[PDB]
Structure formats: structure tokens, C-alpha cells
Design a protein around this ligand. Structure first.
Ligand SMILES: CCCCCCCCCCCCCCCCCC(=O)OC[C@H](COP(=O)([O-])OCC(O)COP(=O)([O-])OC[C@@H](COC(=O)CCCCCCCCCCCCCCCCC)OC(=O)CCCCCCCCCCCCCCCCC)OC(=O)CCCCCCCCCCCCCCCCC
Ligand SMILES: CCCCCCCCCCCCCCCCCC(=O)OC[C@H](COP(=O)([O-])OCC(O)COP(=O)([O-])OC[C@@H](COC(=O)CCCCCCCCCCCCCCCCC)OC(=O)CCCCCCCCCCCCCCCCC)OC(=O)CCCCCCCCCCCCCCCCC
Ligand SMILES: CCCCCCCCCCCCCCCCCC(=O)OC[C@H](COP(=O)(O)OCCN)OC(=O)CCCCCCCCCCCCCCCCC
Ligand SMILES: CCCCCCCCCCCCCCCCCC(=O)OC[C@H](COP(=O)(O)OCCN)OC(=O)CCCCCCCCCCCCCCCCC
Ligand SMILES: CCCCCCCCCCCCCCCCCC(=O)OC[C@H](COP(=O)(O)OCCN)OC(=O)CCCCCCCCCCCCCCCCC
Ligand SMILES: CCCCCCCCCCCCCCCCCC(=O)OC[C@H](COP(=O)(O)OCCN)OC(=O)CCCCCCCCCCCCCCCCC
Ligand SMILES: CCCCCCCCCCCCCCCCCC(=O)OC[C@H](COP(=O)(O)OCCN)OC(=O)CCCCCCCCCCCCCCCCC
Ligand SMILES: CCCCCCCCCCCCCCCCCC(=O)OC[C@H](COP(=O)(O)OCCN)OC(=O)CCCCCCCCCCCCCCCCC
Ligand code: HEC
Ligand code: HEM
Ligand code: HEM
Lengths: 242, 60, 385, 70, 49, 29, 49, 48, 96, 49, 70, 48
């Protein structure tokens, strides 16, 4: 029983429930953790900058964020390409120029895109949390080659990424003791938001319409009985015995 | 008891009045259930909203 | 009579709608298992409408398809509702048709004079399978690419002519952009043919009328359709809407595979390849026989047996209520075609190979045995007197 | 499908003279008894093989996994 | 109510999307031109007389 | 005979207008 | 995929093809061996097709 | 340019004009959204 | 007839400008639609007013849809109707 | 098109709107004149769009 | 949609007892003369306005062009 | 490849295409290199 992984348990996520919502302070903290100790290797490339206004920042904060970076731009009228600071409509910058360079700079392995990394695995949220948090010591009789690290939550047991959620690896602007578990929780919340940004509109509309449709079901049952009453209670005389 | 018959005699002698009544009642009930479910929504989870984060204007 | 107009319903402008929807005489003891045909019509209309609106935002190219789907589902006002309705209404449509088929198989509705209806139904079932399988590809994920490869390379089990057929079907030497464009055009075209087949199905039913839970002559006691069965159909539609909304709004990703959220990559392979949940019994039947030619030549007898059920000149009683042994065999077959589906998803290894070899034996033994009760029941009237 | 001559007599009452809902929950327990007594054989035939196969597969895989352990 | 819901959702699905509305205001630069003449320029999606 | 018909026509127009102001909810008008 | 099955070579999860290390079919539906393409070597490490 | 002229001829109507033109074009000008929209409509209409 | 069109003159019935990829900045000097929309197009540009020009198409379809409901003519075929026959030919010339 | 019409201005042969050089619609069914945007000098030569 | 009582009498001949082609080209010139003499007015009324308008436009355009010269 | 059978034999076109240099996608390193042309290349452009 290898090359499948260990079985990750289930954690009571705040955004679980029938009328539960995201935790926007946790989303803010998770985006901080991403942009400080994650984006050097992976990429999102599906989240824009403006998607965060009204979710974890104002417009001015994200305008400053997007103006920090410098992106390439189309040909100038001379006929050449230049670089200008980013706008709200730009996308999260990529760390490598192409996928071949990504494999070259990490020992052949490819660090996957992180936009949909929660839906694409099986049981994504708890798997990602316990994968990031649960690095461990190999068992009695298993040896890891040089250049790989041991984790029981990956198919095979030998992963290419090293542990990085070390204690105090990021500074929080709200005064929170940044243990590895706190950082993992905030990152998972941010990534889950990035995967499913419509969960709230969805849940509200669903609750409303299930209520209304159950009422309509009661009405439909009454209408049916009212129409069928005459037939289901008549009496007929038939003139036969056996 | 007699409320049913009185309301019937008022609102159900013609059909155009009936259709207008149905449309208006749909509008009002839709808005009312919207309001109710919204109220449950903010009741269930306090301290999680967008504007309940303490530092949303302090990154300058 | 006819010298001046009495009703506008009996006028030519609305004569046939009157005759086939309003006044059409139906037996008065029909139960709820006669609502699923109308419910399936509703499901088909939902699919067509949400498809015509989805294909207003999707670009069928191997560079821009996954991005088109994500742009729809992440950037268009209410586009997540459209996408989820489409991808779950396919599952609802297959569920409704499976229940429909099993109802018709309980009360023996295939027998005379209603076998032309059975034949048209089987043709419709082929069209449904083809359309769903072709349309699982255009999002262009891992499962789309590798399912297309595997299933369309099963078409080379045929003798010499097979390789030319496969090369022509792929549009080249492998699954690539030509397959994507071709599959999109076919997927947009087929549902209209499916609509036409359904209309022919319904006319062929109406030319005799419907069966009844007793399986007897039923022309002495009949009523109108409206308003007596329209209200029953309304109750069915409302319960259906509740079920559908529960799937759309509170669990929209439970009926799929996560791997279709990874962009296509011809070099790596997923460790577990399966088709969408409603193709699994056929998959298990096809993998039961350890031979390519046997694999392709097992599914043709399945449809041949299905289409040759109604022509066994057989027993004189239809409703399985007065038939204990046909009733028991029906329940056995129903349990078997669930066990087969569950096996059609597990790894190909022990013990699953044996338990994937015996259920097809039983699934064919059902069609084998069934004429024997008809012949041996010819003689009940002459014995139990 | 047409004109079988009949000779019968029928009486009927208007829809607005009858209690409509109270009929559902009249004697539900005896309905439960009758329904279960009627359909228990069919329930057995539908449910048996699945449970048997599931238990057999569970035991086989459990024993195999225990066997390969060092 | 349900009919109104479906009609509105389907009809508003066809309106301009968030991507297009994000790029709807900016300022860019021109070049010099002779008195009484014109060289046309470009913006988000509209030239300049 | 005219009065009943014209009154019914006016009331049906009222119903049509109410339906229109249900489907669209403009506060700018 | 490599190093899976009951033979020590490759395993194909599409329809349960179990292969040995040599690659010849021993159990399952494949009737043929894994098809050898044309190739050669240059001096020590270059394996041209 | 034919699409531009003919489909912008629908802003001559009173107050609703600009709104229906912008809703038809899917944006601010004849671009990719209009192209994909028109392709789907073209594949659908002949069956009607 | 169809194959004479396809095989020996397949571009006579089109405008040459559609072999230039779309360029939103420059405008063609003479914009027209296909050959089978030109009567409507001429009726449409015949008015020096946008509202009038657009709402002059509506009488075309209203008249085409309201021909059948005149209820005094008793002879159908134009063979026995000289004046209506002449009006038919003159209408054809005007439509061309 | 600039350089067209009876006014030497920006004439539109799409439906025949003879604007003048001033930009006011003289001949044509145009219900509005050309839109005047916001722009001002920096020193002498540049005006942002 | 019905029929009427008629009372008529008809004789016919088999297809394979009579010459078929020679009827097309029998007496063409008199048929051509009849058609022309019957439909000259329709041809005139169809082709008049086109010629008149074309000549008028040509004349106007050439006059304007030749008057704009130096 | 359009020219073979139309104005040149195959070998002339092969050598002529091998005259020019065009770019190709990334190697394992990740660089845009160049290598001479083939039969399945298109006529080169003079500007960027
Ligand atoms: C599960 C195991 C089977 C359950 C059956 C065992 C049982 O005890 O029920 C028999 C028992 C009596 O059986 P019966 O009278 O011989 O037969 C019922 C007739 O069909 C009487 O028919 P009816 O029309 O008068 O009853 C309407 C409905 C009463 O319900 C209503 O009308 C509204 C109430 C909402 C219910 C949700 O009750 C039903 O019979 C349910 C049928 C609903 C149609 C199903 C259509 C399929 C939808 C497709 C979904 C897509 C997949 O029925 C009930 O217990 C149901 C009573 C529930 C109380 C309703 C009060 C509402 C206020
Ligand atoms: C037609 C009426 C037949 C009802 C079929 C039930 C169904 O489709 O739901 C299974 C459907 C298949 O999705 P899935 O098994 O999660 O997908 C495979 C997973 O990757 C994980 O796969 P797995 O390890 O759970 O095993 C796969 C297996 C799941 O095994 C089960 O059936 C679990 C029991 C539920 O899937 C099937 O059994 C499909 C066989 C039925 C196919 C059509 C049978 C023809 C009927 C004649 O969803 C569920 O398993 C649970 C849904 C819970 C609500 C059930 C309400 C059903 C409506
Ligand atoms: C129920 C009938 C259909 C069965 C659907 C099977 C769904 C299987 C399932 O796993 O449901 C789980 C879901 C809650 O799970 P969740 O965390 O929200 O996300 C999905 C992860 N499983 O749980 C659900 O989806 C249940 C949703 C219940 C919605 C209740 C509606 C609100 C109240 C309406 C009025 C009262 C109901 C009257 C009827
Ligand atoms: C692959 C499929 C591609 C799509 C096919 C196009 C489907 C379009 C559906 C349109 C259906 C055509 C309408 C007319 C056909 C029809 O309704 O047949 C009626 C016939 C009733 O039988 P009967 O009453 O005895 O006939 C005498 C009275 N007219 O009913 C019958 O008995 C069966 C007649 C079948 C129709 C003829 C074929
Ligand atoms: C390969 C190895 C095979 C080993 C198993 C062989 C077992 C012997 C099979 C004999 C078949 C007939 C015996 C069935 C029961 C006989 C008793 C009987 O005649 O009663 C009918 C009984 C239903 O009982 P019932 O009448 O409803 O009782 C209440 C009435 N007041 O009817 C029933 O109980 C159910 C009858 C149908 C199910 C039993 C036979 C199944 C055989 C499967 C055939 C293949 C099916 C594949 C699809
Ligand atoms: C799960 C999927 C089920 C699919 C079943 C397909 C439909 C087959 C069918 O039509 O069954 C009808 C039958 C009703 O019994 P019937 O003889 O028609 O009338 C008795 C009135 N009390 O049904 C039955 O006789 C028994 C149905 C319930 C069986 C209980 C075990 C299932 C749980
Ligand atoms: C102007 C109206 C002119 C006609 C006024 C009444 C004259 C009645 C008449 O008989 O005109 C005859 C003439 C052609 O009709 P006909 O004499 O039958 O010539 C057939 C030759 N093959 O003319 C006609 O029948 C058609 C006259 C043209 C109508 C023009 C209306 C504008
Ligand atoms: C693109 C649009 C092109 C439009 C083409 C015109 C089509 C007009 C169809 C008119 C129908 C028609 O056939 O008119 C026939 C008309 C007289 O025919 P009729 O009187 O009915 O038969 C007598 C037999 N000796 O025939 C005539 O009157 C002859 C007129 C011919 C004049 C042209 C020379
Ligand atoms: C030092 C570079 C580096 C950084 C920084 C990094 N990773 Fe990784 N990551 C990798 C590599 C290399 C892989 C590929 C592992 C493999 O293929 O075996 C990977 C893979 C993954 C996977 C895929 C696991 C799977 O089952 O496919 C996830 C999830 C992941 N990283 C999450 C994260 C998160 C969250 C962070 C931020 C805390 C992060 N990574 C930061 C190097 C990195
Ligand atoms: C899109 C798919 C289908 C549609 C829209 C459809 C529609 C219908 C409708 C509306 C009826 C009459 C209503 C009723 O009796 O419940 C009916 C009857 C019937 N259908 Fe279908 N059906 C479909 C698929 C199938 C299939 C696949 C089969 C068989 C393999 C089938 C077999 C039958 C039979 C046997 C009847 C007889 C009705 C009776 O016994 O009274 N149908 N169908
Ligand atoms: C005119 C009819 C139809 C049109 C225009 C249409 C259009 C489309 C388009 C554009 C897609 C790709 C977008 C996406 O995958 O989200 C799609 C996917 C799909 N279609 Fe359709 N479709 C039609 C009918 C149908 C029907 C009748 C079925 C019946 C089952 C069907 C089943 C599917 C499925 C299963 C998918 C993929 C589900 C998924 O994306 O996960 N389609 N369709």
C-alpha cells in the first residue's frame, strides 16, 4: 500500500456549513504568506489584481501593490518593447519564463500552477493543509535518495519540495504568532477562496430557492388532490358477481 | 372565518385584477424572503465580514 | 357540429395539440412511473438551452479552451450557474432515462403491439451516449484527452480495416486540435437529431396508446389527459426541480472527477482513468473479455439482445404483478447491473476480474432464459384449472 | 381502441364537499405493515448480492494487505 | 417569481463582462502635427479625431 | 356593451404595465 | 506506468495491461509486443532515432 | 465594418437605444465577444 | 447553374475587400453589404433622419404582412386583370 | 473619413453624414456632434487622452 | 376539400404508341411571333425605367465631370 | 513545401530552405535557439 499516500483527516473549516462564509482576515493573511514565501516558485496566472478589492483590501491598497511590480508591454511606436508598472487589470506575475526553465531550476520537477490546486486533487483542502504541514522522519528500512524529501502524504513518499513553513517565516500586520499551523491555515483559506470565489452568492441563492420550491411543492400536492377527488370517491353499480 | 369569503368577493370577480394581484404578491414575497435570508446570513457569522478586519486601510 | 365555430380548441389551428395533449384518452389507473418521459423531455430542453448559451463564450482550440471555460466560470455575470446546470443536467438526464427503461422493463411494455416504440427508444439511447461522450472532451483536461485516446483507439480491434478507421476518426496520428474542432461541431449538431427521434418515438406510442399497471385491455375506463394527469406531472416536475437545485447549489462538484481541472498534457498519464459515472457498466462489460476483438464484439451483442427482446413470441401476460418468477428475475437483474457498474471503476486485478467476468454472464443469461417462461407458460391455462 | 358498450351506473360528489388532506395520515402504521409484508422478498432479492459481494471484497483485501506485511 | 429569475439570469449573461469593464478608462500620449493637419492615435478601443 | 369591454381592456392594460414593471425594476423612471 | 503489476516492468491502467520488464504481453488483452522504432547510437551517449 | 454600421443603427431608437446596442455588442465595440456570439447564433438559426 | 458558379467564376458575387484582415483604425472608402440586402439598404439610407430611416423598414414588413386582409377583390390570377398586371411589372422595375 | 464630403471635414460614407471641419453635423441624420473629451496642455505640445 | 359529380367521357392512348420529341421544334417562328406580339407591352414596361434612369445618370455625371475641369 | 512539383524539384527546395535560419522553442535549458529551415517552414518576414 504505497504510491497512493496517507489518508488525510478532515478539519472543521470555517467556510463549511450550510450558511457559512469565508474569513476575510484569514484570506488577507494567506495572500500575504503567498506573496512572501510562495510566488518565487509557483504561479496563479488566473487571479487578477482587481479581484481582491472589496474582498481583502480597498482599491488604493491594491493600486499600490500593482504599481510595485514592473511588467512588459506591447511595442512602442518606435518598434520596441518596454516595461511599465502594473495596473489593477494585470495578472499575478510568473516566476519563470517557461515550463522548461521551471524544470531546469528545480531538479527536473515541475511546481504546478496553484490557481485550482484545491479542486484538482482529491479532497483538496485537507490534503493541501496536511501536505504542507506534515513533513516527517522516514520509517525503519526506507531510504531517500539525495535531492528528495520524505512526506507520507505524497504518492511514492519522496517529494521534490523542501519544507518552508518554518516558525516565524513571515511577519503579520495584526500581531499574530505565526506558527506553521497558523500559516498553513491562512494559506489554505486563501487558496480555497482563489479556487471557488462564488461560494457565497451560490449558497445564498440556493437557500432561498429551496425554501420557495418546498412551498410550491405543498401547493402542487393540494392542487392534485383537489382535481382527483371526484374520481377517487365515486360509486358504480356493475351487475356481476364472480 | 369570513375573511376568506370577503377577500374572495373583493379580489376574484374579474381576471385582470387577479393577474395584477399575483404579480404584485410575487414581488412583495420575493423581497420579503430576500430580507429574511439576508438577516440570517449576517446573524450566523459575525466578525467575518469584509469591513470587520481591523487594518483594511493601514498598508501605506 | 360543423356549421359555425363552437370551440377554438377544436379548430384546425389547434386540432392536433387538442387531440394529443388535452383530450387524449389515457387509462385512469396509471401510477407515477409514467411521468419520467415528460420529465426527460424537460431535461433535454434544459440541456439545449444552457448549451446554446454556453457556446456563446467558448473557443474550441487546444491553446484557448481551458482558458475559455475558466473565463466563463470566473468572469461572466452568472456564468457559473450556466456551467453547473449543463454539467449536472447531463447526469440528471441519464438518471431519468435509466428509470424510464426499467419501468418499461417491469410492466413488459416492449411486447406487441409496442415494439416499434422499443426500437426507437434503443436508437435514442445510442444517440444520448454518443452525444455525452463527445461533449466530455471540449473542456480539454486530463480525463478528456486520455478518455478520448483510449476509447477511440479501441476502434482498432477490428480486423485489417480497423487502423484506417481509427486514423480517419482521429483526424491525424493522435488526439490533437483536429479532434477538438471535429468533436465540437458534432456535439453542437447531434441534439437536434435526438429531438427528432423523440418526436417519432412519441407518435409511434400514440398510434396505440399506453399500457397500464395491470397489463389488460383498458379501453372501457379511460379519462382525459388535461386536467387529470397534467397535475400529476406538475407534482413530478416540482420534486425534480428540488432535487436538481440541491445538486446545482450545494454540491456541484460531487458528480465528477477532480483530474479534469489539470490542463491536458500528452506526456504524463493519470494513474486512474475512468469514464463519466454513467458509462461504467459498459466499461466493465468491455474489460471483462481479455481480448481486443472480444472487447469490441461484446457490446454489439448487448444492443442486439436489447433490440431483439420484443420479437420472442412469448407469454400472454404482461404485468409482472401476476408473474412471481419474472418479478424475482427482474430484481436479480437490477441488482446485477448495479454491481457491474461498481466493478467498472475498480483496478483491473484480483478479485475484480472474476467478479467482472461473472456479472456479464448473468446479464446475458437474463435475455437467454426469458423466452423459456413464455413457452412453459403457454400451458398454465390447461393445468391449474 | 374504441366503443366497448358497457351498461353501468355511477354517482359522484362535487370537489367542494369533501375533506381532501386528512386521508393521508389516517392509519399509516397498518399501511407500513402491509407494504413491508408485501415487498420484503423483493427487498431481500435486491439487497442480498450487493452486501455479500461487498463483505467478500472487504475480507479479501484486508487479508491480502495483512499478508504482504513484513 | 421563478420564471422571472430564469429570464433575467439568461438575459444578463450576455452583457459585458468584468474583464471588458476593467479596461474602460486611461490616458495615453500623442505626437506633434502640422497646423491644419492630423495624425490619428489609439486608445483602449477608440481612435481620436 | 361598449363600457364593460373598454373597462376590461383598461384593466388588462394595467395588468400588462404591472407585469412590465415587475420584470424591469427601474427607479430612474 | 513503470514498476507496477505482477511482472516487474510497466503497467497500463487504461484496461489493465500488465507488462514484464522486456515489455511482452503475458496477461491481458494486448496481442503484440511493444513496437520497436528505428534508432541507433553515435559514440557513447547519443541515441539518434 | 458592416457589423459596425448595421448593429449601431439600433441606437437611433429613443431612450433604450445605447443600452440595447451595448448589450448586443457584449461590450463597447465590435470585438471577439460579438464574433463568438454570432457564431453560436449562426449555428442555431437554420434548424428553426 | 450552381456548378457554373462554383467551378469557373467563384468570386464574381463578392466584394474584394474581405481578403484584408480586419483593421479597426482605417475605414474602407465604400461600405456595402451583400447583393441581396441592397433594396433594404437603399430604403434605409433614403431618409435624412435616423428614427425615420429605421422606422421606415417597419412599413415594409407591415405591408407585406397585411396584404392578405383586403376583402373585395374577386378574381385572383392577373391574366384577367390587365391593370394589376401592369402594376406588377412596374413594381418589379422599381424594385430592381 | 477625413478628406471627404462637401465640407473638407470628417465625412462618414457608412450612411452619409457630412460633418464640417468644425465637427458639427451639417448634412446627415446624426443626432449628436462629435464628443469633446477632457484634455489640456502641459507646456505647449502634449495633451493626454 | 371534396369532389363533384361530373359526367364526362375520355379516350386515351398508350405512351409507347406515339412520337415524343418532334413536338418541340415543330413550328417555332409562329410561336415566337405570338409570344412577342402578346407580351411586348410587359417587356416595354419592365425595361423602360431602367434605360431611362441609366441614361439620365450617365448624362448628369459626364456633364458634371466635364464642367469641373480647367 | 508548396513549391515542390510546381516550380522546383524537392532537393532544390530542401537546400534553399536550409539556407535560412529560423528560431525554435525551448530546449531543456530554456533558451530560444536557431537552426536551419526545413520543408515545413513558411516564407520568412523582414520585420518583427
Ligand atoms: C421510501 C419508502 C417508500 C415510502 C412509502 C411507504 C409509506 O409509508 O407511504 C405510504 C403512505 C400511504 O400510501 P398510499 O396512500 O397507499 O399511496 C400514496 C398515493 O400515491 C397517494 O398519492 P398523492 O398524490 O395523494 O400523494 C402525494 C404526496 C404528498 O406530498 C405532497 O403532496 C406535498 C408534501 C411534500 C412531500 C415532500 O405523497 C406521495 O405519494 C409522494 C409522491 C410524490 C410524487 C413523486 C414524483 C417523483 C419525483 C421525481 C424526482 C426525480 C428523481 O403514504 C405516505 O406515507 C405519504 C404521506 C406523507 C404526508 C403528506 C402530508 C403533506 C402535508
Ligand atoms: C439510475 C439510478 C441508479 C442510481 C445510481 C447512484 C449514483 O449514480 O450515485 C453515485 C455517484 C457516483 O459518483 P462517485 O462514486 O463519487 O464517483 C467515483 C468516485 O471517484 C469514487 O468512486 P467509488 O470508490 O465511490 O466507486 C464508484 C461507484 C460508487 O459506488 C456507489 O454506488 C456508492 C453508493 C452511493 O460508482 C458507481 O457505483 C456507479 C454505478 C452506477 C452506474 C449506473 C448504474 C446503472 C443502474 C441500472 O455519487 C456517489 O457516489 C454518492 C452520491 C450520494 C447521493 C446518491 C444519490 C444518487 C442519485
Ligand atoms: C438531500 C437530497 C439530495 C441528496 C444530495 C446529496 C449530496 C451529498 C453531500 O455530500 O451533501 C453535502 C452537503 C453539504 O456539504 P458542503 O460542505 O456544503 O459541500 C459539499 C461537500 N460534500 O449537504 C447538502 O447538500 C444538503 C443541502 C441541504 C439544503 C437544505 C435547504 C435549506 C432549507 C430549505 C427549507 C427546509 C427544507 C424543506 C424541504
Ligand atoms: C434518426 C431520426 C432523425 C430525425 C427524424 C425526424 C423526426 C421528425 C418527427 C416528425 C414526425 C412526422 C409527423 C408525421 C408522422 C406521424 O405522425 O405518423 C403518424 C402515425 C399514426 O398512425 P395512424 O393514426 O394509424 O395513421 C393514419 C392517420 N394519419 O404514427 C405511426 O404510426 C408511426 C409513423 C412514423 C412516421 C413515419 C416515418
Ligand atoms: C447457478 C447456480 C444456481 C443455484 C440456485 C438455484 C436455486 C433453484 C432455482 C429454482 C427456481 C424456482 C424456485 C423459486 C422459488 C420457488 C417457490 C415458488 O414457487 O414461489 C415463487 C417464489 C415467490 O414466492 P411468492 O409466491 O411471491 O410468495 C408469496 C405469495 N403469497 O419465487 C421466488 O421466490 C423468486 C423466484 C425467482 C428467483 C429464484 C430463481 C433465480 C434463478 C436465477 C436465474 C438467472 C437470473 C439471471 C438474471
Ligand atoms: C432504486 C431503483 C428502482 C428502479 C425501479 C424501476 C421501476 C420498476 C417499477 O415500476 O416498480 C413498480 C412496483 C410497484 O408495484 P405494482 O405491482 O406496480 O403496484 C403495487 C401497488 N401497491 O414496485 C414494486 O413492486 C416494489 C418496489 C419497492 C421494492 C422495495 C425494495 C427496493 C428498496
Ligand atoms: C394609365 C392607365 C392606362 C390604361 C387605362 C385603361 C386602358 C384599358 C386597356 O385596355 O389598356 C390596354 C393596355 C394593354 O392591355 P391590352 O389591350 O390587353 O394589350 C395586350 C397586347 N398584347 O394597357 C394595360 O392594360 C395596362 C396599362 C398600364 C397601367 C399603368 C398604370 C400606371
Ligand atoms: C431576381 C428577380 C427576377 C424576377 C423575374 C420575374 C419573375 C416574374 C414571375 C411572373 C410569373 C409569370 O410566369 O408570368 C407569366 C406572364 C404571362 O403568363 P400567363 O398569362 O400566365 O400564361 C399564358 C400562356 N400563354 O408572362 C409574361 O407576361 C411575359 C412577360 C415577359 C416580359 C419580359 C421580356
Ligand atoms: C523552493 C521552491 C518551492 C516553493 C517556494 C514552494 N514549493 Fe511547492 N513545490 C515545489 C516543487 C519542486 C514541487 C513539485 C513536487 C514534486 O513534483 O515532487 C512542489 C509541489 C507543490 C504542490 C503539489 C503537491 C501535489 O500533490 O501535486 C503543492 C500543493 C505545493 N507545492 C504547495 C506549495 C505551497 C502552499 C507553497 C507556499 C507555502 C509552496 N508550495 C512553495 C517547490 C516549492
Ligand atoms: C430522451 C429519451 C426518451 C424520451 C424523451 C422518452 C419519452 C417517452 C414518453 C413521453 C413516453 C410516454 C409517457 C409515459 O408513458 O411515461 C414514453 C413511453 C415509452 N418509452 Fe420512452 N423516452 C425516452 C427514452 C426511452 C428509451 C431509451 C426506451 C427503451 C430503451 C424507452 C421506452 C419506452 C416505452 C417502452 C414506452 C411505453 C410506454 C408505456 O408502456 O405505456 N424510452 N417515452
Ligand atoms: C445545441 C445543443 C448543445 C450545445 C450548443 C452544447 C454546448 C456545449 C459546450 C460549448 C460545451 C463546453 C463548455 C463546457 O464544457 O462547460 C459543452 C459541454 C458539455 N455538454 Fe453540451 N451542448 C449541447 C447539448 C448537449 C446535450 C444534449 C448533452 C447531453 C448529455 C450535452 C452534454 C455535455 C457535457 C457532458 C459537457 C461537458 C460537461 C463538463 O464540462 O464537465 N450537451 N456543451
Amino acid at each position: 500500500e504505497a504510491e497512493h499516500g496517507l489518508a488525510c483527516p478532515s478539519y472543521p473549516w470555517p467556510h463549511q456549513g450550510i450558511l457559512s462564509s469565508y474569513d476575510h482576515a484569514s484570506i488577507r493573511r494567506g495572500h500575504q504568506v503567498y506573496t512572501q514565501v510562495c510566488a518565487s516558485c509557483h504561479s496563479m496566472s488566473l487571479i487578477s489584481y482587481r479581484d481582491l478589492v472589496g474582498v481583502a483590501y480597498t482599491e488604493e491598497e491594491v493600486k499600490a501593490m500593482a504599481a510595485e511590480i514592473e511588467v512588459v508591454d506591447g511595442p512602442n511606436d518606435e518598434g520596441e518593447m518596454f516595461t511599465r508598472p502594473g495596473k489593477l487589470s494585470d495578472r499575478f506575475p510568473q516566476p519563470y519564463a517557461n515550463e522548461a526553465a521551471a524544470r531546469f531550476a528545480n531538479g527536473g520537477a515541475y511546481p504546478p500552477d496553484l490557481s485550482l490546486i484545491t479542486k484538482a486533487p482529491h479532497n483538496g483542502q485537507n490534503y493541501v493543509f496536511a501536505l504542507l504541514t506534515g513533513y516527517r522522519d522516514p520509517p525503519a528500512g526506507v531510504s531517500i535518495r539525495e535531492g528528495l524529501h520524505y512526506n507520507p502524504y505524497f504518492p511514492g513518499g519522496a517529494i521534490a519540495m523542501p519544507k518552508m513553513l518554518n516558525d516565524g517565516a513571515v511577519e503579520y500586520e495584526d500581531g499574530t504568532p505565526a506558527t506553521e499551523s497558523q500559516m498553513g491555515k491562512d494559506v489554505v483559506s486563501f487558496l480555497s477562496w482563489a479556487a471557488e470565489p462564488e461560494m457565497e452568492e451560490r449558497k445564498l441563492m440556493g437557500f432561498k430557492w429551496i425554501f420557495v420550491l418546498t412551498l410550491a411543492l405543498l401547493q402542487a400536492g393540494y392542487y392534485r388532490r383537489l382535481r382527483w377527488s371526484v374520481l377517487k370517491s365515486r360509486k358504480l353499480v356493475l351487475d356481476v358477481v364472480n | 372565518g369570513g375573511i376568506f369569503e370577503a377577500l374572495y368577493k373583493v379580489l376574484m370577480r374579474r381576471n385582470s385584477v387577479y393577474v395584477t394581484f399575483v404579480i404584485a404578491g410575487a414581488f412583495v414575497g420575493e423581497r420579503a424572503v430576500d430580507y429574511g435570508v439576508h438577516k440570517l446570513w449576517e446573524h450566523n457569522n459575525v466578525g467575518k465580514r469584509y469591513e470587520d478586519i481591523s487594518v483594511l486601510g493601514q498598508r501605506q | 357540429m360543423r356549421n359555425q365555430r363552437f370551440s377554438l380548441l377544436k379548430q384546425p389551428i389547434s386540432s392536433t395539440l387538442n387531440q394529443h395533449l388535452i383530450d387524449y384518452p389515457t387509462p385512469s389507473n396509471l401510477s407515477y412511473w409514467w411521468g419520467f418521459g415528460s420529465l426527460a423531455g424537460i431535461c433535454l430542453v434544459i440541456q439545449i438551452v444552457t448549451g446554446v448559451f454556453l457556446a456563446m463564450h467558448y473557443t474550441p482550440h487546444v491553446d484557448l479552451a481551458f482558458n475559455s471555460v475558466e473565463h466563463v466560470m470566473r468572469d461572466v455575470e452568472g456564468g457559473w450557474l450556466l456551467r453547473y446546470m449543463h454539467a449536472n443536467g447531463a447526469s440528471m438526464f441519464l438518471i431519468v432515462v435509466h428509470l424510464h427503461i426499467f419501468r418499461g422493463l417491469y410492466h413488459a411494455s416492449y411486447s406487441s403491439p409496442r415494439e416499434f416504440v422499443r426500437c426507437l427508444g434503443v436508437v435514442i439511447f445510442l444517440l444520448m451516449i454518443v452525444t455525452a461522450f463527445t461533449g466530455y472532451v471540449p473542456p480539454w483536461g486530463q480525463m478528456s484527452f486520455w478518455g478520448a485516446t483510449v476509447i477511440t483507439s479501441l476502434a482498432s480491434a477490428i480486423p485489417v480495416v480497423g487502423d484506417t478507421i481509427v486514423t480517419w476518426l482521429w483526424g491525424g496520428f493522435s488526439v490533437d486540435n483536429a479532434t477538438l474542432n471535429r468533436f465540437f461541431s458534432l456535439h453542437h449538431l447531434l441534439p437536434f437529431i435526438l429531438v427528432g427521434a423523440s418526436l417519432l418515438h412519441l407518435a409511434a406510442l400514440h398510434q396505440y396508446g399506453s399500457n397500464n399497471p395491470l397489463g389488460v385491455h383498458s379501453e372501457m375506463d379511460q379519462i382525459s389527459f388535461y386536467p387529470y394527469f397534467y397535475v400529476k406531472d406538475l407534482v413530478g416536475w416540482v420534486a425534480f426541480a428540488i432535487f436538481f437545485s440541491i445538486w446545482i447549489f450545494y454540491a456541484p462538484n460531487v458528480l465528477g472527477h477532480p483530474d479534469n481541472y489539470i490542463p491536458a498534457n500528452p506526456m504524463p498519464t493519470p494513474p486512474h482513468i475512468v469514464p463519466e459515472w454513467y458509462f461504467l457498466p459498459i466499461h466493465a462489460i468491455l474489460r471483462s473479455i481479455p481480448d481486443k476483438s472480444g472487447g469490441v464484439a461484446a457490446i454489439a451483442p448487448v444492443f442486439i439482445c436489447l433490440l431483439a427482446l420484443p420479437f420472442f413470441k412469448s407469454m400472454y401476460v404482461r404485468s409482472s404483478s401476476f408473474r412471481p418468477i419474472h418479478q424475482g428475475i427482474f430484481w436479480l437483474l437490477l441488482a446485477d447491473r448495479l454491481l457491474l457498474g461498481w466493478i467498472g471503476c475498480q483496478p483491473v486485478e484480483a478479485p475484480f476480474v472474476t467478479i467482472g467476468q461473472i456479472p456479464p454472464l448473468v446479464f446475458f443469461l437474463f435475455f437467454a432464459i426469458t423466452p423459456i417462461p413464455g413457452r412453459v407458460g403457454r400451458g398454465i391455462p390447461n393445468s391449474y384449472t | 381502441k374504441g366503443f366497448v358498450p358497457m351498461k353501468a351506473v355511477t354517482y359522484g360528489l362535487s370537489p367542494f364537499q369533501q375533506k381532501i388532506m386528512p386521508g393521508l395520515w389516517k392509519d399509516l402504521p397498518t399501511k407500513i405493515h402491509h407494504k413491508v409484508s408485501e415487498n420484503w422478498i423483493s427487498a431481500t432479492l435486491l439487497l442480498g448480492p450487493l452486501v455479500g459481494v461487498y463483505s467478500y471484497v472487504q475480507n479479501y483485501q484486508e487479508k491480502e494487505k495483512l499478508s504482504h506485511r513484513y | 417569481s421563478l420564471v422571472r429569475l430564469l429570464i433575467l439570469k439568461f438575459v444578463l449573461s450576455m452583457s459585458a463582462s468584468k474583464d471588458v469593464l476593467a479596461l474602460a478608462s486611461l490616458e495615453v500620449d500623442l505626437s506633434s502635427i502640422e497646423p491644419g493637419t492630423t495624425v490619428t492615435v489609439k486608445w483602449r478601443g477608440k481612435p481620436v479625431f | 356593451i361598449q363600457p364593460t369591454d373598454v373597462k376590461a381592456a383598461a384593466m388588462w392594460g394595467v395588468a400588462a404595465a404591472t407585469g412590465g414593471l415587475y420584470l424591469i425594476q427601474p427607479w430612474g423612471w | 506506468l513503470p514498476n507496477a503489476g505482477d511482472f516487474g516492468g510497466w503497467f497500463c491502467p487504461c484496461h489493465g495491461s500488465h507488462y514484464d520488464i522486456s515489455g511482452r504481453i503475458r496477461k491481458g488483452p494486448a496481442p503484440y509486443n511493444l513496437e520497436v522504432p528505428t534508432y541507433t547510437f553515435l559514440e557513447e551517449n547519443k541515441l539518434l532515432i
